[PDB]
Structure formats: structure tokens, C-alpha cells
Subunit: 246 residues, 2 copies
């Protein structure tokens, strides 16, 4: 199972900060055939970032439309992404489910659209704090994963990301042990619905808060195949996070 | 009052179609100091387009975030738009109100963020068929415009667009006279809430179906200062539509 480390720059960056950042990133010597390292800049920053990053680095966009080409002002369709040779796309990130009312139905349609166009997809899901305290974690995640999991035809092209919302900006922290449990269950769902071969083939990333300090203990976990890094990916120290997966 | 002709390519285009289209566009000879012509490509297409189009053409993006930089995956902030020297942004296009639940609230915050960052904004609004059959046109439009009109500090940097939804995809057609009445009322609203000077300065574009045939009859109208063109702007004949404003 090939490790997957992704940098979700989210809504951050300037042409200068990116030029400076990608420069550091490029100094890290790693074998792309042994590790997947993806960077997701802001859509308008894609071209700039892509030119600046060396081939060993994959690039994608933080969101894609559930509709195809057509009258949908402000959207980016998978057809357009394909035409642009954009490799990955993030779908269902909690920030979009939260602020932009994206639903599991949306996540499903977006995934289907992405795959139909040969885009690799990093699909996110997770439970809120309320959901965790009510002890509905497994339940919620099962409903979320089962909302799209039956569309995955190739388990190398779809990467799942567990976002423990209950730990993001709530004063709480997710421990490697806790993530390991959830990951194991997420993988179990995939097995029971797609098969063991698939379940062992698909990468499941930790989408919680990752930093130079906790990355090693997290990646160590059996069912944690890497992570979707937030703010830490906006600093040069991100390479040390990539290193912990080499 | 300087005429304003915009091309809202919406979610359309491939690197090749754009290369070809901008080619035609560049052939049109016009004085940018006398006429404002703006093209709004897909975010991931901005750069490609900007490089292909000549200086005489202004460019912008079809949407902008109501938040600033930070944790908002998939969004583009005004701060980022400014760093990239993106001149215009479209806000409140009915397509984002319809499919992406953008509210007047969202439009206000997006406009504010836009101006705060020195971006020029093309703000859209308009009533539905249901709302027109109930004779609530002026009422609805009055409510929409008054949701953001007080934020306008420079009436050259904000462009209003009246989108007659009741005539978009309903089989009905808006006549230059009908549009004119609304336009006059919209301007009247600005006059009373911002002053006469401002009112005669701000441009109010027609956002309905515009084509090589009806553009002249529309631009003729007193209070119609140009248009936000859709599918017609994806064709070479778009130049003719520009000509009708020269």
C-alpha cells in the first residue's frame, strides 16, 4: 500500500509565498513511484503552482462541480479538469459540507463525475463533536462512506480521508490510537461492500490536525496510509512531514 | 457613461477552444478607454485566457469567497484575486443563487470583501417568473439591490446586472421596453439611496439572453449600459455584439 501525503493549501497563498514554498518542496528528494505527494493549491493558483513544482509532485484542485460543462457560473467541471490534466480533486471536505451545504448526494455525484473523467479523488468524511459524544461515530461514518463507496471501480484512484471534526477547533485532540480504530472500521466497511482485495488496496488518510510533531506516530498506525495536511502544508517544515512517510 | 460588455463563459471551454476564441476576439479593433470589454473564464482557465487576450480586454473571475484567506477549501478570496491582479468578479449570478444557495447576505459580504480589496464587481440580481406573475418585480429587485447598494463607495467599480429570470428557460422573452422599465427603476433606486450623481454614473447591464440579433435594440435603451453575455460569448460572433456598443 503506497503512502499518500497531500497538502491542502485551502484558501491561502500569493504568487510569492507559493514560489518560495514550492522551492523548498522541490529540494526534498523522494521517489514518486514509492510515495504519492499531492499539492492542492487554489484554483487560480493551479497553473502557477504546477509550473513551479517538479514532476515528482502531483497537483489537484480543492473542489469540482457535480454538474458537467454548461451554465453553472463559478464552477469547475471534471471535463475541464481532465482537459487541463489536473490529476486529483478533493471532494466532501468538511469545510465545504459545513460552509457550502455540500451533502452526501453531492459527494456522490461529484465522485461519479470525477471518475467518469479519469480524475483521481480524495474523498473526505467524518463526524462532528456532537455526533461523537452521542456515540454515533461508526454510524455516521458508515452512512457517509456508503453514500459513494459503491462507485469506486479502481481502488488506486480513490483515496479516503477521515476528518475527525470533533477535534478540529474544539479544544480536543485525536490520538493515533483513536484514529486507528476509526480507520480500521472505515476499511472494514470497504471490505464488506467491495471486497478484501479492494479494502487492502485503498488508502485511508488522516485528515485531522497533522504537524511535524505527531505525523510519525499517526503514519505508524496500521490503517493510516498518510494524511491530508492543513496549515502545516503552508510551511517549509511540511517536507519533514513527507519524510515521516519515506 | 461608459458602455460595458462582458463575456460570462460560465462553466465552458477547453484550452483549445479558448485559444481559438480569444484569437477572434483579439482581431476586433476597439479603444478600451471608450468601451469596457470583460471576459470571465473558468478560474482554472484565468491564466491561460489572460495571456491569450490582449490588454484591451479586461478579465475577471465568475465568483469570489465571502471569507478572506484561511480554512475555506475550494474558495477563492478577494485577497488572492488582488494578488493576481484580477480586475473583476461576478457576484450573485442567479446560477449561484439557484444551485449554490447564495443569498443576498452572501452577496453583501462578497461585495464588501471585493471592494475592500480593490476589485471591481459585477453584481447580479433579478426576479423569477413566479415573482413576475405576481407583479412583484420592482419589489423583489428593490429588496435585492438595497441589500448591498449602501456599500458602493465608487460608482465606477461596481456594475449592476439585471437578470430577468422569468425569461430564462421559461419559453418567454424579455423585450427591450420591458428591460428598460426595470433598468430605470433600478437606477431610480440608486438615485434615492445614493444620490443622482452616483445613479447616472453606475452602469446597469442587461443579463438576459443576448445575441447578435437583439443586442442593438437593447443597448439603444436609455438605462441599459451593456450586457453580461452568456452562450453568445462562446462564439466568434461575440465580436459583433461588442461592435453594437462601439
Amino acid at each position: 500500500r503506497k503512502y499518500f501525503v497531500a497538502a491542502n493549501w485551502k484558501c491561502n497563498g500569493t504568487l510569492e509565498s507559493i514560489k518560495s514554498l514550492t522551492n523548498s518542496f522541490n529540494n526534498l528528494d523522494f521517489d514518486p513511484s514509492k510515495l504519492d505527494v499531492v499539492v492542492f493549491p487554489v484554483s487560480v493558483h493551479y497553473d502557477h503552482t504546477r509550473k513551479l513544482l517538479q514532476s515528482k509532485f502531483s497537483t489537484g484542485i480543492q473542489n469540482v462541480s457535480k454538474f458537467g460543462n454548461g451554465s453553472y457560473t463559478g464552477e469547475v467541471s471534471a471535463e475541464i479538469a481532465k482537459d487541463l490534466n489536473i490529476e486529483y480533486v478533493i471532494i466532501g471536505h468538511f469545510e465545504r459540507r459545513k460552509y457550502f451545504h455540500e451533502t452526501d448526494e453531492d459527494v456522490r455525484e461529484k465522485l461519479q463525475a470525477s471518475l467518469k473523467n479519469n480524475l483521481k479523488a480524495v474523498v473526505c468524511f467524518g463526524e462532528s463533536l456532537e455526533q461523537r459524544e452521542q456515540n454515533k461515530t461508526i454510524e455516521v461514518i458508515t452512512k457517509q462512506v456508503k453514500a459513494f463507496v459503491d462507485l469506486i471501480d479502481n481502488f488506486d484512484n480513490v483515496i479516503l480521508v477521515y476528518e475527525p471534526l470533533f477535534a478540529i477547533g474544539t479544544g480536543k485532540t485525536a490520538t493515533p490510537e483513536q484514529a486507528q480504530l476509526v480507520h480500521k472500521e472505515i476499511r472494514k466497511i470497504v471490505k464488506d461492500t467491495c471486497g478484501e482485495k479492494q479494502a487492502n488496496q485503498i488508502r485511508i488518510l488522516y485528515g485531522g490536525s497533522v504537524n511535524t510533531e505527531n505525523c510519525s506516530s499517526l503514519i505508524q498506525q496500521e490503517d493510516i496510509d498518510g494524511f491530508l495536511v492543513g496549515n502545516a502544508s503552508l510551511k517549509e517544515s511540511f517536507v519533514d512531514i513527507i519524510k515521516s512517510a519515506m
